[PDB]
Design a protein around this ligand. Structure first.
Ligand SMILES: O=P(O)(O)O[C@H]1[C@H](OP(=O)(O)O)[C@@H](OP(=O)(O)O)[C@H](OP(=O)(O)O)[C@@H](OP(=O)(O)O)[C@H]1OP(=O)(O)O
Ligand SMILES: O=P(O)(O)O[C@H]1[C@H](OP(=O)(O)O)[C@@H](OP(=O)(O)O)[C@H](OP(=O)(O)O)[C@@H](OP(=O)(O)O)[C@H]1OP(=O)(O)O
Lengths: 607, 607
């Protein structure tokens, strides 16, 4: 079939139902099938009708039901037998045409040991490429006719309501186009010489030369998202039952080397693997509005990560912690020599540290060494000029201020010997854990404020000087809490309400105005901008109240450093996992804004 | 576009590479792009070339690289601008054509309150159905040209090896066909009146009128297979760690109400949900060889179960047991009033019993009341004439003989009050658990032998009398073990070796010969039959040695009834879960045989 040719022999879902509309106008105004084949030595399914079950007072329109329908049996059967007969004529001349190929494909290495051979390939390539697809059209011809003859009977099983839909179907399925599979013995016959010596030795390269409608997505990754989602949830749920039934869940039990050894590590991993998830719940929202994240970030093609390849990292590696922090609760239910069981926390960190810098090819290299091309520029702060993916992962760390106290308690309990010596207070005695585990905790707001300084003494403009002010603002507002542990009075307490509400507007101003681009009164939209890259004007305003409700989580988690003081712990992992949820919609409206104020639409091939 | 018309403007992956083959013959015999638009007030991307980086000794073929390629920039750009201009001409006359529709679609309910309206629908249905698809062709025109211009440069980045694949791409993506999305603002413009008043009020019915390449499979079930696979494995693995660290795993601990209360539950549910899985690993092998299981079984259309809807039952309901038999280990680690914690085993059975007979619609009704149309005929054995799905689920129970002892120990510990009265030996004192928990254990081999009796006094033939002999054979061979507990001597021990090896050939004969159809010496294949419904003649013989190796698991599990005698327990759930693995390949070669000796090919629509 060079062109698709079954035109009168297509599905006749149009013509048959308006005759079923014509018995409908006879209502106000089921059959035993006489199976006979052709008396001409052929297989023409001429089906004689019989009315028995008292349809109407005079069945003048009941024969109109079969005045056309039994011809539709023949209409497929006259064609499919002849289209098979044409494909028998195109099924045996090819046996002779590839038989002279046998004379050629036998001597090409015999006589090489002793130039039309390449001309001989196109003589059989272009032949048997679409000659297969003439059969795949013929299977699609068969399936659509079953999709015809089954689905032309929906409303007849309501206005009459019988068991005819399998009864009629067994002169359809027993007719020649389905009671045989003689086109399907050709479905493996077409690849007898195509696979082994025509296209080479491959299996996918031989498939690609003749397959349109190629292949769907290999869904061995929708499963592996699910395998590790459920393995993490059930290992977590078998940690809030067993630790409940141990005594330790409320700390009404034995030694407190649980909530100071490995709560500072199921905290640091529940916050880091909530952010990587919300980075993958934002590629699902960037692609679904075509916000072109690869060109703005200057990514490239470069093995495009998707929202199934960061939904796979954040689940496969969070069940790997919820497992190793389940075999470590068991050993601390009975006791298994504390001097060596308390490296399992500090080694799971060490296992994850080397996967990130693993140089081989396994765990997403060319997007895991690009990420160390980003946190190399940010830590060397006043140098290393800012691009868009040098700004972005520097202001994803202003939600991981509570995470960066649980990667400084750990490397105090693993670097000065506090694990083998059995002491959970070795860090928090000296001045080291009064300022320098809370002053270097505001290191991410120093890296931002020294990237705007190079974005000022570079590019010149004034707007990268009020950006610089924004992080110095939330470095004084917690710098007053440094001088609030002493002189707790009416002195530096009308100052930690002063500078901490100066900050919380000066971050709230900058979010909508100079990051999200919103709050323009000189517009056609109330409190939004002119043009929107999204649907209905209702969820825009819901995200504007959630950057103010959720910035009470911020300024609680950066003035109430959890592992330095008061032992109310679960607030330090609930509110601190709300600021990580707050940024995650800030990532959306910062990229939508700097695409609707980038004005280009460079999408490399997506859809 | 009534016909697909981009023929010279198709991907030119043919013509450009043979010119790249022509610079290849110049080798033995990269550019800064001068971006200029049209000087005629248009957007014709005429790109002037420049050679700087010293390609060859004389660059006569380097200009041949750009003698055609920059024309391919124009060839898409002259067409896409004009095809958009045609779709502007087909983008503004439709604004006027649907504007007279506004005059019609406003008065149809005003004047109804006071017949060309239906003729007006086809005036805009058939217009805007494929006029959308003219744009979906134009997006496919754009994507294939990106799929052209990216994938015409594979071998040029090896013979020269530069960074040109994103450098060249930014005069491709910045050209008018991708630097705009003016066809994509029409992608939502086509459904402004189509969705709300043309097709009605639906979302899928409005989509079906104009969508070929409709939709792939909704993969919210490849995830839910995976969610419950991992939830079962991690709840199991958090049961072989916690019970290991309890004392009870080797029974070196407290009271033995573990391995007599709930090991006869996690035994009866690890065998029943291994068989339902291997019934779904056989629909994956029946469909993949087109063995037509629905017509042989006389199924019908009738909401066709797949191998994702029995891989979903057997995983979602095995994590629901591995959960409830994990909250029941915890309560029996500390003790929570034994008189009421020991109903959780006998209620999980009761929960699963009522799901099977649940009549509403939830858990696969019309295939769960058909299954009680099967185990109603089998238990009323000598009546109820045999069809193929009355035979099949009667001889799936001759692998669940060890399962049917753990559904008779349970309903002795739940029916005569042995749970509140605290006694794990109340059943196994009287004669009740010496014969009648082992003689009614061979009830499934009685239902088979009384279906062949109605298949004899019906249909007449001799072959349904040697079938009847086959189950009476393995009813005497274990009936000698009834008389082996006494007179253990050289008496009835040259009889339990006698009748039990008479059985194990008389099942081994019937499997290959009169069920699988194999072992015909009068054939062209050694020890197989003539025609095969499968691939290479190597895995046929591997399944013939696995019905003899694995029938030592049988006759061990039906002479060594596990909860009646000797306390070696894990052999009673390893070997008994091998006979359930043995049948599971018997289901394959029994249906392949009775399709290659059914000779019809009635496939209702699959592929
Ligand atoms: O295109 P039209 O000639 O206007 O026909 C329509 C259309 O039928 P086709 O798509 O088969 O041409 C509708 O079919 P659906 O696509 O909605 O299923 C169907 O609407 P109802 O089924 O809601 O009535 C109705 O066909 P029929 O009359 O066969 O029901 C029929 O309209 P008329 O035949 O009434 O013109
Ligand atoms: O169909 P032909 O005229 O015989 O051309 C083939 C074919 O090219 P097309 O499919 O583009 O027509 C091969 O392409 P692939 O499908 O294998 O990629 C390619 O084979 P190699 O790439 O292995 O050489 C080779 O094209 P080229 O010469 O451009 O490499 C070329 O054969 P000739 O051009 O050598 O006749």
């Amino acid at each position: 079939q060079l062109v698709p040719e079954w035109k009168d022999a297509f599905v006749d879902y149009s013509q048959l139902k308006k005759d079923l509309k014509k018995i409908h106008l006879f209502t106000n105004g089921v059959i035993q099938v006489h199976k006979k084949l052709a008396s001409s030595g052929s297989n023409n399914d001429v089906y004689e009708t019989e009315l028995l079950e008292k349809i109407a007072d005079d069945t003048d329109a009941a024969k109109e039901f079969f005045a056309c329908l039994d011809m539709q049996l023949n209409k497929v059967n006259q064609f499919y037998k002849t289209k098979e007969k044409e494909f028998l004529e195109r099924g045996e001349c090819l046996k002779k045409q590839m038989d002279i190929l046998i004379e050629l494909k036998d001597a090409f290495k015999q006589k090489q040991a002793n130039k039309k051979l390449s001309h001989a390939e196109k003589m059989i390539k272009g032949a048997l490429t679409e000659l297969f697809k003439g059969l795949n059209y013929l299977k699609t011809y068969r399936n659509l006719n079953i999709l015809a003859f089954m689905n032309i009977l929906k409303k007849f099983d309501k206005v009459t309501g019988k068991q005819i839909l399998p009864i009629y179907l067994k002169v359809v399925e027993s007719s020649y186009f389905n009671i045989s599979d003689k086109v399907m013995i050709l479905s493996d016959e077409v690849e007898e010489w195509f696979i082994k010596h025509l296209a080479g030795e491959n299996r996918r390269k031989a498939m690609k030369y003749l397959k349109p409608h190629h292949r769907k997505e290999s869904h061995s990754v929708t499963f592996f998202i699910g395998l590790f989602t459920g393995c993490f949830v059930a290992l977590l749920a078998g940690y809030i039952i067993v630790a409940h039934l141990t005594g330790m869940y409320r700390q009404h039990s034995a030694n407190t080397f649980y909530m100071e050894t490995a709560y500072p590590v199921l905290s640091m991993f529940g916050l880091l693997f909530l952010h990587l998830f919300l980075y993958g719940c934002n590629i699902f929202m960037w692609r679904k509005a075509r916000i072109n994240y690869s060109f703005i970030f200057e990514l490239g093609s470069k093995n495009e990560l998707k929202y199934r390849d960061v939904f796979l990292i954040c689940t496969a590696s969070m069940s790997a912690i919820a497992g190793v922090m389940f075999v470590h609760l068991s050993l601390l239910e009975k006791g298994y020599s504390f001097r060596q069981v308390q490296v399992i926390p500090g080694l799971l960190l060490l296992g994850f540290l080397l996967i990130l810098i693993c140089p081989l090819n396994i765990f997403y290299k060319s997007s895991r060494y690009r990420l160390i091309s980003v946190i190399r520029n940010i830590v060397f702060s006043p140098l290393y000029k800012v691009v868009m993916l040098d700004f972005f992962m520097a202001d994803q760390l202003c939600s991981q201020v509570p995470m960066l106290r649980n990667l400084e308690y750990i490397a105090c309990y693993y670097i000065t010997g506090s694990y083998a010596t059995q002491d959970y207070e070795y860090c928090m005695r000296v001045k080291y854990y009064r300022d320098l585990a809370y002053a270097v905790s505001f290191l991410p707001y120093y890296w931002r404020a020294m990237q705007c300084a190079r974005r000022w003494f570079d590019e010149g403009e004034t707007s990268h000087l009020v950006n610089l002010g924004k992080y110095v603002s939330a470095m004084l507002a917690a710098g007053t809490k440094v001088a609030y542990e002493k002189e707790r009075s009416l002195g530096w307490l009308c100052l930690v309400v002063a500078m901490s509400s100066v900050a919380t507007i000066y971050q709230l101003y900058w979010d909508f105005v100079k990051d999200w681009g919103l709050l323009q009164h000189n517009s056609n939209n109330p409190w939004l901008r002119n043009q929107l890259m999204l649907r209905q004007k209702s969820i825009y305003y819901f995200s504007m109240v959630l950057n103010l409700v959720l910035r009470l989580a911020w300024l609680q988690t950066v003035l109430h450093s959890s592992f330095e003081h008061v032992d109310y712990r679960v607030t330090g992992l609930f509110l601190a996992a709300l600021e990580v949820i707050r940024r995650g919609q800030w990532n959306f409206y910062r990229l939508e804004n700097e695409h609707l104020n980038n004005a280009g639409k460079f999408r490399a091939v997506k859809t």
